Design an enzyme around this catalytic site. Structure first.
Site, PDB file in Angstrom:
ATOM      1  N   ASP A  15      33.061  37.380  45.292  1.00  0.00           N
ATOM      2  CA  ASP A  15      34.229  38.152  45.044  1.00  0.00           C
ATOM      3  C   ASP A  15      35.524  38.035  46.052  1.00  0.00           C
ATOM      4  O   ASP A  15      35.378  36.955  46.943  1.00  0.00           O
ATOM      5  CB  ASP A  15      33.329  39.865  44.977  1.00  0.00           C
ATOM      6  CG  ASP A  15      34.751  39.818  43.925  1.00  0.00           C
ATOM      7  OD1 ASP A  15      35.436  39.391  42.788  1.00  0.00           O
ATOM      8  OD2 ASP A  15      36.273  40.723  45.166  1.00  0.00           O
ATOM      9  N   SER A  16      36.213  38.027  44.780  1.00  0.00           N
ATOM     10  CA  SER A  16      37.467  37.604  45.986  1.00  0.00           C
ATOM     11  C   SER A  16      38.321  37.663  46.908  1.00  0.00           C
ATOM     12  O   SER A  16      38.736  37.777  48.208  1.00  0.00           O
ATOM     13  CB  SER A  16      38.916  37.133  44.695  1.00  0.00           C
ATOM     14  OG  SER A  16      39.165  38.731  44.128  1.00  0.00           O
ATOM     15  N   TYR A  47      43.044  36.739  43.736  1.00  0.00           N
ATOM     16  CA  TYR A  47      42.572  34.911  43.451  1.00  0.00           C
ATOM     17  C   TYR A  47      44.147  35.021  41.895  1.00  0.00           C
ATOM     18  O   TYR A  47      44.472  34.381  41.300  1.00  0.00           O
ATOM     19  CB  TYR A  47      41.581  35.007  42.665  1.00  0.00           C
ATOM     20  CG  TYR A  47      40.645  34.588  43.947  1.00  0.00           C
ATOM     21  CD1 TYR A  47      41.374  34.307  44.709  1.00  0.00           C
ATOM     22  CD2 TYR A  47      39.144  33.709  43.575  1.00  0.00           C
ATOM     23  CE1 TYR A  47      40.432  33.844  46.747  1.00  0.00           C
ATOM     24  CE2 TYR A  47      38.667  33.450  45.210  1.00  0.00           C
ATOM     25  CZ  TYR A  47      39.326  33.542  45.904  1.00  0.00           C
ATOM     26  OH  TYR A  47      38.289  32.596  46.998  1.00  0.00           O
ATOM     27  N   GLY A  48      43.437  36.686  41.432  1.00  0.00           N
ATOM     28  CA  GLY A  48      44.230  37.019  40.479  1.00  0.00           C
ATOM     29  C   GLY A  48      45.687  36.774  39.788  1.00  0.00           C
ATOM     30  O   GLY A  48      46.224  36.680  38.397  1.00  0.00           O
ATOM     31  N   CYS A  78      33.232  38.136  40.737  1.00  0.00           N
ATOM     32  CA  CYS A  78      34.758  37.693  40.487  1.00  0.00           C
ATOM     33  C   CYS A  78      35.351  38.025  38.966  1.00  0.00           C
ATOM     34  O   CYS A  78      34.294  36.439  38.135  1.00  0.00           O
ATOM     35  CB  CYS A  78      35.651  37.405  41.509  1.00  0.00           C
ATOM     36  SG  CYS A  78      37.365  37.212  41.581  1.00  0.00           S
ATOM     37  N   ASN A  79      35.583  38.311  38.179  1.00  0.00           N
ATOM     38  CA  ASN A  79      35.901  38.027  36.679  1.00  0.00           C
ATOM     39  C   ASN A  79      37.290  36.777  37.064  1.00  0.00           C
ATOM     40  O   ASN A  79      37.423  35.944  35.962  1.00  0.00           O
ATOM     41  CB  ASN A  79      36.573  38.897  35.761  1.00  0.00           C
ATOM     42  CG  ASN A  79      35.287  40.139  35.250  1.00  0.00           C
ATOM     43  OD1 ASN A  79      35.966  40.707  36.614  1.00  0.00           O
ATOM     44  ND2 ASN A  79      35.699  40.883  34.789  1.00  0.00           N
ATOM     45  N   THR A  80      38.046  36.624  37.910  1.00  0.00           N
ATOM     46  CA  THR A  80      39.232  35.530  37.707  1.00  0.00           C
ATOM     47  C   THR A  80      37.623  34.076  37.891  1.00  0.00           C
ATOM     48  O   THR A  80      38.706  32.853  37.399  1.00  0.00           O
ATOM     49  CB  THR A  80      40.168  36.061  39.090  1.00  0.00           C
ATOM     50  OG1 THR A  80      40.480  36.947  38.613  1.00  0.00           O
ATOM     51  CG2 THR A  80      40.551  34.725  39.211  1.00  0.00           C
ATOM     52  N   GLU A 158      43.230  49.008  45.142  1.00  0.00           N
ATOM     53  CA  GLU A 158      42.536  48.974  47.091  1.00  0.00           C
ATOM     54  C   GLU A 158      43.626  50.226  47.842  1.00  0.00           C
ATOM     55  O   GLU A 158      43.191  50.262  48.389  1.00  0.00           O
ATOM     56  CB  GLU A 158      42.809  47.453  47.477  1.00  0.00           C
ATOM     57  CG  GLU A 158      42.243  46.723  46.513  1.00  0.00           C
ATOM     58  CD  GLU A 158      42.868  45.249  47.145  1.00  0.00           C
ATOM     59  OE1 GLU A 158      41.999  44.134  46.868  1.00  0.00           O
ATOM     60  OE2 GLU A 158      43.024  44.940  48.025  1.00  0.00           O
ATOM     61  N   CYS A 188      37.651  43.113  34.940  1.00  0.00           N
ATOM     62  CA  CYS A 188      38.066  42.988  36.398  1.00  0.00           C
ATOM     63  C   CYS A 188      37.264  43.364  37.611  1.00  0.00           C
ATOM     64  O   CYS A 188      36.755  44.907  36.861  1.00  0.00           O
ATOM     65  CB  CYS A 188      39.645  43.612  37.026  1.00  0.00           C
ATOM     66  SG  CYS A 188      40.329  43.260  38.432  1.00  0.00           S
ATOM     67  N   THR A 189      37.341  43.350  38.297  1.00  0.00           N
ATOM     68  CA  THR A 189      36.118  44.205  39.322  1.00  0.00           C
ATOM     69  C   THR A 189      36.477  45.489  39.926  1.00  0.00           C
ATOM     70  O   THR A 189      35.902  46.098  40.107  1.00  0.00           O
ATOM     71  CB  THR A 189      35.960  43.228  41.277  1.00  0.00           C
ATOM     72  OG1 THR A 189      36.803  43.187  40.855  1.00  0.00           O
ATOM     73  CG2 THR A 189      35.016  42.030  40.852  1.00  0.00           C
ATOM     74  N   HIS A 190      38.176  45.321  39.530  1.00  0.00           N
ATOM     75  CA  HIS A 190      38.515  46.987  40.521  1.00  0.00           C
ATOM     76  C   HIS A 190      38.404  47.703  39.899  1.00  0.00           C
ATOM     77  O   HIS A 190      38.875  48.870  39.655  1.00  0.00           O
ATOM     78  CB  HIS A 190      40.123  46.722  40.813  1.00  0.00           C
ATOM     79  CG  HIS A 190      39.666  45.471  42.496  1.00  0.00           C
ATOM     80  ND1 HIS A 190      39.569  44.138  42.008  1.00  0.00           N
ATOM     81  CD2 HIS A 190      41.093  45.875  43.153  1.00  0.00           C
ATOM     82  CE1 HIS A 190      39.885  43.948  43.514  1.00  0.00           C
ATOM     83  NE2 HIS A 190      40.630  44.836  44.655  1.00  0.00           N
TER      84      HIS A 190
HETATM   85  N1  LIG Z   1      38.078  39.922  41.868  1.00  0.00           N
HETATM   86  C1  LIG Z   1      39.464  40.002  41.050  1.00  0.00           C
HETATM   87  C2  LIG Z   1      40.808  41.647  41.181  1.00  0.00           C
HETATM   88  C3  LIG Z   1      41.538  40.766  42.238  1.00  0.00           C
HETATM   89  C4  LIG Z   1      41.972  39.189  42.586  1.00  0.00           C
HETATM   90  O1  LIG Z   1      43.280  39.204  41.985  1.00  0.00           O
HETATM   91  O2  LIG Z   1      41.144  38.177  43.214  1.00  0.00           O
HETATM   92  C5  LIG Z   1      38.962  39.837  39.503  1.00  0.00           C
HETATM   93  O3  LIG Z   1      38.002  40.384  39.074  1.00  0.00           O
HETATM   94  O4  LIG Z   1      39.846  39.204  38.579  1.00  0.00           O
END
Ligand SMILES: N[C@H](CCC(=O)O)C(=O)O
Ligand SMILES: [Cl-]
Ligand SMILES: [Cl-]
Length: 255
Positions: A15-16, A47-48, A78-80, A158, A188-190
């Site tokens: 993940d990011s 990363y997003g 990570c979805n991004t 966060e 999105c993971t969050h």
């Molecule tokens: N892990 C990213 C969210 C945090 C990021 O922007 O890196 C996602 O799932 O899109």
């Protein structure tokens, strides 16, 4: 004499940053694997809000990091990253690599089973811009869709903001004049950390699609996974302050 890992299913999760723990949680509780190596790029997260070339470059570096571990497959939590880097990752890797987007789309179709139902996809700017969710859903005839970048949710999570007036204001900001969806993809993971608040905001007509639970169902269908006896052995790595990552993991996963 000498023994080497025999029949042990060991996987990597990338993940990011720390958000990917939401996916780790689903994988862990599902008891699919014997050992899981989690790596979060916390030095460079998020990363997003960044561009395709950077995201791909960073993911390929992550692949390099993992190659020291001899994993059976790699999950991109990570979805991004899932929106941009899968082709490049697969071209390089010699083990299966799965992201969370295909899984999330599959889970949405199973939940709705009606192409006329309303879908709201919420995600980072980069994920929405990729049009990956939109294209998949459209290719399945699901045209009743909104795709919204809800970027501030990431740093709010966060900062530990999971409810309250300030979060309500963010939801009102992003969702003003939006129709109530039949399914909300937490792309999105969050976002699972905001699930209770999102569900209260939208009401009981809205089914929440969790990317971690989605990838669990996806993996059971795609790979040959026998349920394991015990919980997996977990190892955490991060490009910065790994102890903070472990701390968050202990809390989120109730370790
Ligand atoms: N892990 C990213 C969210 C945090 C990021 O922007 O890196 C996602 O799932 O899109
Ligand atoms: Cl995939
Ligand atoms: Cl699809």
């Amino acid at each position: 004499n000498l023994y080497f890992q025999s029949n042990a299913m060991k996987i990597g999760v990338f993940d990011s940053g720390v958000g990917g723990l939401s996916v780790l949680k689903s994988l862990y509780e599902a008891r699919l694997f014997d050992e899981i190596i989690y790596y979060g790029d916390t030095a460079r997260v998020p990363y997003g809000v960044k561009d395709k070339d950077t995201i791909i470059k960073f993911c390929l570096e992550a692949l390099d990091f993992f190659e020291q571990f001899q994993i059976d497959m790699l999950i991109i939590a990570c979805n991004t990253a899932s929106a941009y880097a899968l082709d490049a990752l697969r071209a390089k890797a010699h083990f299966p690599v799965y992201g969370v987007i295909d899984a999330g789309v599959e889970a949405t179709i199973k939940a709705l089973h009606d192409k006329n139902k309303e879908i709201l996809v919420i995600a980072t700017k980069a994920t929405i811009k990729s049009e990956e969710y939109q294209k998949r859903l459209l290719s399945q005839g699901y045209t009743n869709i909104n795709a919204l970048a809800t970027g501030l949710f990431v740093p709010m999570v966060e900062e530990g903001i999971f409810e309250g007036d300030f979060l309500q204001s963010a939801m009102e900001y992003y969702f003003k004049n939006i129709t109530t969806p039949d399914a909300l993809i937490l792309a999105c993971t969050h976002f699972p950390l905001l699930g209770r608040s999102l569900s209260k905001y939208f009401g009981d007509k809205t089914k929440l699609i969790h990317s971690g639970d989605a990838i669990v169902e996806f993996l059971k269908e795609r790979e040959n996974i026998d349920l394991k006896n015990h919980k997996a052995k977990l190892h955490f790595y991060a490009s910065s302050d790994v102890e903070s990552l472990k701390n968050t993991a202990k809390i989120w996963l109730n370790l």
